[PDB]
Design an enzyme around this catalytic site. Structure first.
Site, PDB file in Angstrom:
ATOM      1  N   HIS A  68       0.844  -1.224   0.000  1.00 39.84           N
ATOM      2  CA  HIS A  68       0.000   0.000   0.000  1.00 39.84           C
ATOM      3  C   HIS A  68       0.872   1.263   0.000  1.00 39.84           C
ATOM      4  O   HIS A  68       0.766   2.082   0.904  1.00 39.84           O
ATOM      5  CB  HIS A  68      -0.996  -0.057   1.148  1.00 39.84           C
ATOM      6  CG  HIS A  68      -2.152  -0.946   0.856  1.00 39.84           C
ATOM      7  ND1 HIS A  68      -2.249  -2.221   1.378  1.00 39.84           N
ATOM      8  CD2 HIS A  68      -3.230  -0.769   0.068  1.00 39.84           C
ATOM      9  CE1 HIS A  68      -3.355  -2.779   0.931  1.00 39.84           C
ATOM     10  NE2 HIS A  68      -3.986  -1.905   0.145  1.00 39.84           N
ATOM     11  N   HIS A  72       2.037   1.715  -5.611  1.00 45.55           N
ATOM     12  CA  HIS A  72       0.625   1.279  -5.779  1.00 45.55           C
ATOM     13  C   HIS A  72      -0.205   2.463  -6.277  1.00 45.55           C
ATOM     14  O   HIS A  72      -0.917   2.296  -7.277  1.00 45.55           O
ATOM     15  CB  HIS A  72       0.094   0.657  -4.495  1.00 45.55           C
ATOM     16  CG  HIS A  72      -1.362   0.374  -4.534  1.00 45.55           C
ATOM     17  ND1 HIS A  72      -1.887  -0.621  -5.318  1.00 45.55           N
ATOM     18  CD2 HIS A  72      -2.401   0.950  -3.897  1.00 45.55           C
ATOM     19  CE1 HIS A  72      -3.192  -0.664  -5.139  1.00 45.55           C
ATOM     20  NE2 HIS A  72      -3.528   0.289  -4.275  1.00 45.55           N
ATOM     21  N   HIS A 106      -5.700   7.606  -3.463  1.00 45.41           N
ATOM     22  CA  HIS A 106      -6.764   6.695  -2.941  1.00 45.41           C
ATOM     23  C   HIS A 106      -6.286   5.865  -1.743  1.00 45.41           C
ATOM     24  O   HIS A 106      -7.151   5.336  -1.023  1.00 45.41           O
ATOM     25  CB  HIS A 106      -7.353   5.806  -4.042  1.00 45.41           C
ATOM     26  CG  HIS A 106      -6.572   4.559  -4.250  1.00 45.41           C
ATOM     27  ND1 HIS A 106      -5.337   4.565  -4.851  1.00 45.41           N
ATOM     28  CD2 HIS A 106      -6.818   3.279  -3.900  1.00 45.41           C
ATOM     29  CE1 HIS A 106      -4.866   3.331  -4.877  1.00 45.41           C
ATOM     30  NE2 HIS A 106      -5.749   2.527  -4.305  1.00 45.41           N
ATOM     31  N   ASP A 107      -4.990   5.744  -1.485  1.00 41.65           N
ATOM     32  CA  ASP A 107      -4.509   4.967  -0.300  1.00 41.65           C
ATOM     33  C   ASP A 107      -3.566   5.835   0.555  1.00 41.65           C
ATOM     34  O   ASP A 107      -2.770   5.258   1.321  1.00 41.65           O
ATOM     35  CB  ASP A 107      -3.861   3.654  -0.734  1.00 41.65           C
ATOM     36  CG  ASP A 107      -4.793   2.461  -0.879  1.00 41.65           C
ATOM     37  OD1 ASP A 107      -5.789   2.351  -0.116  1.00 41.65           O
ATOM     38  OD2 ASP A 107      -4.484   1.610  -1.735  1.00 41.65           O
ATOM     39  N   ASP A 217      -7.672  -0.461  -8.887  1.00 44.92           N
ATOM     40  CA  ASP A 217      -7.127  -0.857  -7.574  1.00 44.92           C
ATOM     41  C   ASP A 217      -6.644  -2.302  -7.639  1.00 44.92           C
ATOM     42  O   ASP A 217      -5.618  -2.607  -7.007  1.00 44.92           O
ATOM     43  CB  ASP A 217      -8.173  -0.704  -6.489  1.00 44.92           C
ATOM     44  CG  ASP A 217      -7.559  -0.545  -5.130  1.00 44.92           C
ATOM     45  OD1 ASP A 217      -6.320  -0.367  -5.043  1.00 44.92           O
ATOM     46  OD2 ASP A 217      -8.323  -0.557  -4.187  1.00 44.92           O
ATOM     47  N   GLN A 269      -5.915 -17.445  -4.178  1.00 44.12           N
ATOM     48  CA  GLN A 269      -5.852 -16.637  -5.425  1.00 44.12           C
ATOM     49  C   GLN A 269      -6.974 -17.068  -6.382  1.00 44.12           C
ATOM     50  O   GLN A 269      -7.589 -16.166  -6.973  1.00 44.12           O
ATOM     51  CB  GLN A 269      -4.477 -16.723  -6.091  1.00 44.12           C
ATOM     52  CG  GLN A 269      -3.382 -15.970  -5.334  1.00 44.12           C
ATOM     53  CD  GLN A 269      -3.660 -14.488  -5.270  1.00 44.12           C
ATOM     54  OE1 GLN A 269      -3.708 -13.806  -6.285  1.00 44.12           O
ATOM     55  NE2 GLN A 269      -3.893 -13.990  -4.065  1.00 44.12           N
TER      56      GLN A 269
END
Ligand SMILES: Cn1ncc(C(=O)N2CCC2)c1C(=O)Nc1cc(-c2ccccn2)[nH]n1
Ligand SMILES: [Mg+2]
Ligand SMILES: [Zn+2]
EC number: 3.1.4.17
Length: 313
Positions: A68, A72, A106-107, A217, A269
């Site tokens: 994060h 990213h 956004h993060d 994202d 996954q």
């Protein structure tokens, strides 16, 4: 004004493609971002001195966590650039402006822990924001940085345009809360199948931008396999640290966050691709057909995770 950002030839060409990786050279990412604003929005929609200062304050407010992080931020912004450049005429000037910034911010100030872990830790942010806890914080951080002297990149917008862009950015950042994604895609799925979907309807636009945000994202799953696989290690490095912190609080963590259940990752996954990513890019491709390469890339990477399980790598 007549100062265009340029990129070396290989990046000039590859940055247009959905599967572009921004590279291991930190110091090039700001340039890559401004390049994308200039091509996507225009050279005139931000004063370069204010944009450059905003970008570097945003960088400073990302933490040196494994996933994060600033990389990213810029990766998620590039996928938004690729969607916007492949769907030119569908989006307004304020949307192109807002969404690249939304993605970059956004993060902001992510600590590498889930909303769940903040609530169980009883972090102060979880009393301030009961749901979408980190995401309300990221929007709050975005506004703080816009209000630093010389950082207000929206300064030359009308009072109403300014209010509209911040509203676009807020809804965009809230939508990166994956808890909100499932309901949003179901609604978009129905609306598309029943023919009721209408991009002149603002509440419908909002839903489509939410989906675009989820798609950007999640975009590590749309890369060349080696990018996808090596990004997954960073993703799990945060997950396992959170699992460690859950154990320290006396709580057995979910298997996703348990470094003792490393063997379960390939199957986890498959779950993730089938439950989240594939449905995300499927619906996105139905609503925006030129985004089909993200769905194709995602299916290829699912098939790579199936090979890991079959022991063919
Ligand atoms: C690839 N990728 N990108 C974003 C995310 C994700 O969920 N994010 C970003 C922060 C929230 C993932 C991911 O791996 N999610 C998983 C893994 C498992 C999983 C389940 C059981 C066992 C092992 N693993 N379930 N869901
Ligand atoms: Mg987030
Ligand atoms: Zn993110």
């Amino acid at each position: 004004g007549l100062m265009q950002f340029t990129l070396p030839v290989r990046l000039c060409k590859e940055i247009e493609l959905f599967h572009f990786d921004i590279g291991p050279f930190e110091n090039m990412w700001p340039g890559i971002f401004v390049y994308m604003v200039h091509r996507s929005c225009g050279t005139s929609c931000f004063e370069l001195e204010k944009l450059c200062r905003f970008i570097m304050s945003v960088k400073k407010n990302y933490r040196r966590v494994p996933y994060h992080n600033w990389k990213h931020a810029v990766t998620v912004a590039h996928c938004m650039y690729a969607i916007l450049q492949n769907n030119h005429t569908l989006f307004t000037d304020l949307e192109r402006k807002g969404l690249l910034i939304a993605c970059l911010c956004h993060d902001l100030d992510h600590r590498g822990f889930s909303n769940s872990y903040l609530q169980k830790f009883d972090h102060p942010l979880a009393a301030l924001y009961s749901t979408s806890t980190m995401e309300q914080h990221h929007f709050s951080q975005t506004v703080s940085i816009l209000q630093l002297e010389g950082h207000n990149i929206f300064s030359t917008l009308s009072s109403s345009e300014y209010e509209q862009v911040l509203e676009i950015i807020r809804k965009a950042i809230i939508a990166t809360d994956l808890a909100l994604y499932f309901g949003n895609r179901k609604q978009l799925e129905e609306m598309y199948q029943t023919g009721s979907l209408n991009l002149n309807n603002q509440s419908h636009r909002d839903r489509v931008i939410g989906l675009m945000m989820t798609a950007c994202d999640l975009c590590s799953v749309t890369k060349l396999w080696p990018v996808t696989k090596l990004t997954a290690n960073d993703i799990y490095a945060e997950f396992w640290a959170e699992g460690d912190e859950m154990k320290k609080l006396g709580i057995q963590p979910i298997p996703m966050m348990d470094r003792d259940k490393k063997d379960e990752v390939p199957q986890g996954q498959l779950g993730f691709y089938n439950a989240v990513a594939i449905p995300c890019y499927t619906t996105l491709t139905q609503i925006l057909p030129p985004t089909e390469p993200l769905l194709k890339a995602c299916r290829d990477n699912l098939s790579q995770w199936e090979k890991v399980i079959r022991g063919e790598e």
